[PDB]
Amino acid sequence: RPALYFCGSIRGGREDRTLYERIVSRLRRFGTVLTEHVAAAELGDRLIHEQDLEWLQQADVVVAEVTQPSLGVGYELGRAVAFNKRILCLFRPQSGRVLSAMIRGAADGSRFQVWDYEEGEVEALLDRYFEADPLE
Template sequence: MSLKIYFAGSIRAGRADAHIYAKIVDILKKYGSVLTEHVGNPNMTEKGDVLLTDKEIHDRDVDWLKQSDVLVAEVTQVSLGVGYEIGRAVAMGKKTLCLYRPQPDKRLSAMVRGSADITVVDYSEVQVESILESYFKTFIR
């Protein structure tokens, strides 16, 4: 059985980290099927998926979240959508991993870092692969 992984990263709130999302998605593919692979597409703009209405995007993404076994979110770029997805995942009882690159002038929300239901890992880009490897070793039996 292959894991179904929901990857969350900022789209409309900014695509400055799209290259990092692409790297994370590529690594996640080692561990299962990434239902939201498009989030890592470096060609996607802040407009997102323009062929669908907001309702269609919401309903599709919530359906993918329901199907998923785990949510992995890159949370450095502040995003209401990613926060919403994290909240929904926690409410559904999904395993939830948030990756955050510490910033000198910003702090991660206490609602994420303070939750006992969310694993938060501070990281630098060079650490992504080893962090995900460690996380999925404990996840997969």
């Protein structure tokens, strides 16, 4: 099965955890979600970084929920771009916040895309994304 790497804020703040839960659940339909407890309710920094970096290199796609600002999510995206990974970022404008110019500016609109969305449609958007370019 293909491998997916999901990114979402933890020490940046866990406001969106229930949404991360939904996203991870839907991503699993398309392959193994290596990071499936960015979403765990009850949540060796070197060991964490090394295991995550192993996972990131094996991933066939990186999906990041980037509404909550987070050093770790940004770092994962930076490493992912340097690995030239396929990357999808998901951002919610209804938060009132404006997304980092660095993340929106890193997008090229094909291999690295940033999609604005509202919470209710996120499963349908993931379905759309992977039907247009399947992971094999």
